[PDB]
Design an enzyme around this catalytic site. Structure first.
Site, PDB file in Angstrom:
ATOM      1  N   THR A   1      -4.694  70.564  43.143  1.00 58.82           N
ATOM      2  CA  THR A   1      -5.588  70.168  42.062  1.00 58.82           C
ATOM      3  C   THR A   1      -6.258  68.873  42.468  1.00 58.82           C
ATOM      4  OG1 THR A   1      -4.292  71.330  40.398  1.00 58.82           O
ATOM      5  CG2 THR A   1      -5.807  69.665  39.583  1.00 58.82           C
TER       6      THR A   1
ATOM      7  N   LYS B   1     -10.121  74.701  35.455  1.00 61.81           N
ATOM      8  CA  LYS B   1      -8.801  74.169  35.129  1.00 61.81           C
ATOM      9  C   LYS B   1      -8.918  72.791  34.478  1.00 61.81           C
ATOM     10  CE  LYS B   1      -4.422  72.502  36.852  1.00 61.81           C
ATOM     11  NZ  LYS B   1      -3.474  72.333  37.971  1.00 61.81           N
TER      12      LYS B   1
ATOM     13  N   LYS C   1      -2.311  63.133  35.302  1.00 63.98           N
ATOM     14  CA  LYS C   1      -3.034  63.478  36.552  1.00 63.98           C
ATOM     15  C   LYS C   1      -4.329  64.307  36.315  1.00 63.98           C
ATOM     16  CE  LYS C   1      -2.959  66.231  40.760  1.00 63.98           C
ATOM     17  NZ  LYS C   1      -2.444  66.803  42.044  1.00 63.98           N
TER      18      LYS C   1
END
Ligand SMILES: C[C@@H](CCC(=O)O)C(=O)O
Ligand SMILES: C[C@@H](CCC(=O)O)C(=O)O
Lengths: 290, 290
Positions: free
Chosen positions: B92, B167, B242
């Site tokens: 990610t 996402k 995050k």
């Protein structure tokens, strides 16, 4: 078959009272806007000259009124006129403080009282699919059910007096925050080069899915029935969402709660209401575009 | 199929174990001996540098902590890879970094996807990860048999970067929703509305979303939710923090206007300073810090 006094025959109260007529109830109406009274009389409400006259011969008194002030004022003019142990149901959306004050006022005059505010708008109202969220005694709701049922898709008991207004305002605070966050996601996607359809497909299939996207999608295309495809016609107007958010902020202020995003959503909707009160509340997405 | 798997951490280790399990030849690299050793115990042939692991591979998968480490791995290994090797980055990272790294790989004659994942260590182990994929449809097709044994779902999101975009947009919405729900529960409680009543109403109304129906932040209404188990993740505040940082990078990079997403980001960055190890739903107990 009960006799019902129906006080407040506007956008919600008129279709609501029509369904009661249709169910075989004798409905005695009052509204101080003669336009509203006349509409309800056309669908079989017997319209009276004064709220006190309407309520004189009722087993049940329903109020559907714009504010807590107007509900408080109406209760003060009419409770003495009603027969002892008449059942009052306030289906207006008012503050939790106001609902409790007026519930207590009704009980001090010898009346049963519930708060039963509703979701579903005018379309829900006309089709009799409203959700009633009820605060007050379980036995009082039992007595009320036959009257609420011809107006309702669901009836849910939320707790003691006030809990109906509390439940509704809590949900609608959440809703407002979600509608803004969904609009943020869709604009960020557009600047990222992620298509609207792609974002829709992912969020609705993932943990972010919610009514604001799956039903109320703020971009045209992915959900053809959403307001974004019909010039943001309500739907659920910014005017009304701004009312509910003022009521949420009243609740926040009365409890000392902290609701950082709910309050931020209140401010955002308050600003947007000044100029776009008439637009569905999903139209707040315009404020995020330059 | 021979697969080089670069990054054998908490996600990387079980993912690559499923690939071994599905009959692939897995070559691996990680800079932590404990990670490498673990991976080697489930059948990964572990190499001392990443260019080495890549040498014989038809597919190279990265699972790495930042864009910078991803970019650096790519420039360390691209020359060692065979032509038309299929590179899949499931780390990610920012959309910008994803696109840069994608361009870098296809200039070396490689085929490349971004395929970040949702589901965590538990999804990784159970082979139920959701891969959100950016890149060419034809490249995803070729990648499909590799991803299937790690995956519960595979969604093509668009061109390169669209997977990271999708996402990060979903996760920004989720974080807002998790906070908004906490606010509603705290508010309900101060209003004397029970947790269960609010739960019943919201889950049957427009406010419903995963953050309540599955991640309910008060104990009781959803017995398996982290609130009943000392806010054990689940999905840690550290990892939500995050993704939100990446959301704020994407907002800065585009000049987007995301008030509630950014407010959520602030809230969780602060919360991660004390409770990084708790499920992100634990935010319910930090609202009075605000
Ligand atoms: C909502 C009510 C049924 C009444 C109706 O369908 O109009 C009930 O199911 O409690
Ligand atoms: C349903 C799933 C098949 C891969 C698998 O075998 O888990 C997928 O479509 O990704």
């Amino acid at each position: 078959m009960t006799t019902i006094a129906f006080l407040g025959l506007g956008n919600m109260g008129a279709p609501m009272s029509a369904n009661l007529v249709g169910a075989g109830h004798v409905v005695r109406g009052f509204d101080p806007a003669p336009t509203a009274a006349s509409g309800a009389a056309a669908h079989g409400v017997a319209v009276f000259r004064s709220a006190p006259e309407a309520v004189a011969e009722a087993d049940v008194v329903i109020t559907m009124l714009p504010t807590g002030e107007v509900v408080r004022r109406c209760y003060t003019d009419v409770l003495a006129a009603a027969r002892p142990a008449t059942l009052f149901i306030d289906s207006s959306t008012i503050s939790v403080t106001d609902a409790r004050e007026v519930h207590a006022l009704a009980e001090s005059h010898g009346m049963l009282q519930l708060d039963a505010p509703v979701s579903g708008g005018v379309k829900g109202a006309a089709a009799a699919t409203l959700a009633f969220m009820v605060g007050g005694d379980e036995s009082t709701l039992r007595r009320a059910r036959p009257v609420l049922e011809p107006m309702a898709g669901k009836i849910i008991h939320c707790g003691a007096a006030g809990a109906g207004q509390a439940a509704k305002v809590c949900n609608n605070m959440v809703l407002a925050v979600q509608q803004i966050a969904i609009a943020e996601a869709f604009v960020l996607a557009e600047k990222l080069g992620l298509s609207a359809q792609s974002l829709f497909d992912v969020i609705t299939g993932a943990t972010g899915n919610c009514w604001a996207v799956h039903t109320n999608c703020p971009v045209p295309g992915p959900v053809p029935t959403s307001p974004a495809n019909n010039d943001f016609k309500p739907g659920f107007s910014t005017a009304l969402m701004n009312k509910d958010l003022g009521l949420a902020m009243d609740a926040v202020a009365a409890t000392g709660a902290t609701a950082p995003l709910g309050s931020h959503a209140a401010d955002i909707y308050a600003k947007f209401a000044a100029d776009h009160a008439d637009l569905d509340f999903s139209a707040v997405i315009h404020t995020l575009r330059a």
